[PDB]
Amino acid sequence: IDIHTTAGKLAELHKRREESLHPVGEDAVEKVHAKGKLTARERIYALLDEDSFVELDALAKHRSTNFNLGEKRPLGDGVVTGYGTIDGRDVCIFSQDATVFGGSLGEVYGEKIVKVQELAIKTGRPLIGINDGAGARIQEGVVSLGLYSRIFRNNILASGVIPQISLIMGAAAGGHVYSPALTDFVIMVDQTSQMFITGPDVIKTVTGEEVTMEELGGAHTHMAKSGTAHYAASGEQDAFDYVRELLSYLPPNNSTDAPRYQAAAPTGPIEENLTDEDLELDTLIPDSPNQPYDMHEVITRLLDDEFLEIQAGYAQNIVVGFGRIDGRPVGIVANQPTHFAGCLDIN
Amino acid sequence: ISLIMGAAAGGHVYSPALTDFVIMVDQTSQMFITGPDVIKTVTGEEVTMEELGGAHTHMAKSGTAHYAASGEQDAFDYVRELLSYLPPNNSTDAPRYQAAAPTGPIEENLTDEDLELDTLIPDSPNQPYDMHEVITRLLDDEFLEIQAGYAQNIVVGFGRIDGRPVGIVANQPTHFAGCLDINASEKAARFVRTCDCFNIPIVMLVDVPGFLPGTDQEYNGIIRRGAKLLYAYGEATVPKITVITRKAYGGAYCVMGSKDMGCDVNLAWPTAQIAVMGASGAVGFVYRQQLAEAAANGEDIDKLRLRLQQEYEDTLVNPYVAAERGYVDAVIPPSHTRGYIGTALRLLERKIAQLPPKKHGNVPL
Amino acid sequence: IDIHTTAGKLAELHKRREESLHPVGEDAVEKVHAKGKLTARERIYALLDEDSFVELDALAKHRSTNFNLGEKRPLGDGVVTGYGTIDGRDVCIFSQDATVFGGSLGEVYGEKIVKVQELAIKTGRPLIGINDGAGARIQEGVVSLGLYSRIFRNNILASGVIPQ
């Protein structure tokens, strides 16, 4: 074990690569599993294809000396970044470890995220971010705010260029929540995840309103009240199935075509290629001018079956979402007569 | 520019919304999609056209009207003035008035008015002061305020500095202590985008303690709507100058023309308080354990939590931590502000900024 | 002069501002004068047009804590950056102070230079660099190396765009 020989050095590296798997001891990983939740990395391993993850800055450590912070310096800083592939397509991803400083962002922690953001924009690949953690790390100072800006800045720079998906499986309080809003799609876990600027405590001691974290910013309130959540996953795994499904419709970037499936080669005319499912639409509209009907009946009959609805629990008077018509991905936008007669409203 | 000078109903109201500025005349001008009649014979609600969509409401409630004129003449005056700050199109630079040629340095061209800013900030850390006192003294006199009767916790408008047109975006300590909220955010976001569209430099007067707490802010989508101000600024490519006169905490600091947010020149007054959060709730986290032994062992908290709150305040809550990091280009006297913005505008005159190639972004709506 | 009053905070600024002119005591300044040389700052004033210089990151200080380096944290970190004019035209400039750590490049010192470069490129104006100092600060470690590279890169990006 001579730390001076090449062999000793390689051995030293494997020790750190090892500790990084549990930066704050294995006992911490136990509590996480004891709550049915997954680890920051286990989530990446779950979402990305098997054995496709390539971690970056896995051994980085914070460099602060304020308020006895130089006492505890975990590997990773409390964040797991890197890249892999979701269904064969390269993607850049990062997951926050709430067990490490409550998932609060520090300088190195920020640098690690900024690195992934620049990688995704540079390679023109999607950027997936799993959020879970308290506000900025106060001990480090304003450096955290500075890095925050750096992160937001890249989000608005990548907006509409690179698909950006945000997965909320934790709490996530503070300016931390502004990053997800800037992205394209925000996926939440109904219950196991919240989102809010100010915590119930402060809200309590400033307004008097007494509310719980769930009430204040759970998946259901951001899905039917704020209109910020695009999907409320029933469980962590479901949250992932949604994210892969979403990416299946989108291209790697704005300069690329949305992926298409094999398109059938019919013979026409349409009047001879009409199927039973098609004809069912000739009698779907009620003989009465006001009698409502589920617009989903029309949607499901038009495309190859299997509609990925967006914000299904928000403004149900309008239905939007992804699907495929003849192997071609299309965006559906329909009014739902079964709600407000299909009228349009602010939401 | 959209002038509403009568009752505008139906599709007659979408065109205005799509334009950049909406000027209405208070009393003689309305604006609504559905009329009171239909509303009543449907919801049962009883309202007049004036309450439904008059200038009073579209200015203070919906945040749609950028100006509520008293008379039609007033409306014209506003539009005539408004156009004097904007160029004919986004391909041309904003018109400039005869710029003044000083002698320099700044420390020698300080008017008695400039000096008034050196003592404007109260000695009491939380005592309010109207930010208008700072705007009036900075620009060449004459402020064309936008949405003045909406989200008063934030002030936006056009004015001139050294003859150069600028878009002013400042917080208002006399309303919510300067805090940011849904409405204020949206009010600024759109304004910022507008300035950028027509090459108008964005000057920001910072002084926000944070975001206004409240369940409603959340439920109504503060996170989503708040982002707009972030998006707008981060997107802008026009010269950006930010001056922190006092408070700047947490995320608010960021969304307020922060250095790392793309701001070109960041200035700060000696009274600036840039930090993650107020020293008040800071001690609770920082000196966590030390306060834990204030309930068990040596116990006196509340006389300890006030000593620590003062030590942290007197050592971290200031403009030098940020200045040392570079997030602030320089910490200067309030009086020096006006002259500093002048040279800055000149330096950034022909600034070069290229936004990523894309049909368009995807700002939250 | 109460640190808790606006007037005191204002006076505090003018106190550091004054110190930034001699980050290492007056004697050091008299030492370079006795050698028949100008100060890093005086050089900037000489070149640029009278009363035109606008200093950047004047009160900056290094954030290192290696090898008792935390004892000496001079203002400006050994380099004077900012802009001004030369014959009426705008220019960007930085001068290195050899009396501060030997003119050695540190993290902050580097950041200040990087900032000027990015300004020169952004504004599209000439970048004047007055060099005078040793290599990198061995005490700060590879950090200085990263910044050196950062400086070099910005140099080639500006090459042919901005007179340097």
What is the topology?
The structure is cut from a larger assembly and holds three copies of chain A.
Chain A: H1 6-19, H2 26-34, H3 40-47, E1 54-56, E2 79-85, E3 90-96, H4 107-123, E4 127-131, H5 143-158, E5 164-168, H6 178-182, E6 185-189, H7 200-207, H8 213-217, H9 219-224, E7 231-233, H10 236-249, H11 276-279, H12 296-302, E8 308-310, E9 318-324, E10 329-335
Parallel strand pairs in A: 3-4, 4-5, 5-6, 6-7
Antiparallel strand pairs in A: 1-2, 2-3, 8-9, 9-10
Helix pairs in contact in A: 4-5
Task: Report on this structure.
The structure is cut from a larger assembly and holds three copies of chain A. Chain A is of the alpha/beta class and 347 residues long. Chain A has a single domain, classed as 2-enoyl-CoA Hydratase, Chain A, domain 1, CATH 3.90.226. Helix content of chain A is 33%, strand content 15%. Chain A is built from twelve helices and ten strands. In chain A, the strands form two sheets. In chain A, strands 1-2-3-4-5-6-7 form a seven-stranded mixed beta sheet, sandwiched between helices. In chain A, strands 8-9-10 form a three-stranded antiparallel beta sheet, covered by helices on one side. In chain A, helix 4 runs parallel beside helix 5 (143-158). The longest helix of chain A is centred in the N-terminal third of the chain and has 17 residues, at 107-123. The radius of gyration of chain A is 24 Å and the shape is globular. Chains in contact: A-B, B-C. Chains A and B meet through helix 5, helix 6, helix 7 and helix 8 of A and helix 9, helix 10, helix 11, helix 12 and helix 15 of B. It is classed as ligase. Keywords: carboxylase, carboxyltransferase, acetyl-CoA carboxylase, propionyl-CoA carboxylase, Acyl-CoA Carboxylase, mycolic acid, fatty acid, polyketide, Ligase. Crystal Structure of the Acyl-CoA Carboxylase, AccD5, from Mycobacterium tuberculosis. Chains A, B, C: Probable propionyl-CoA carboxylase beta chain 5.
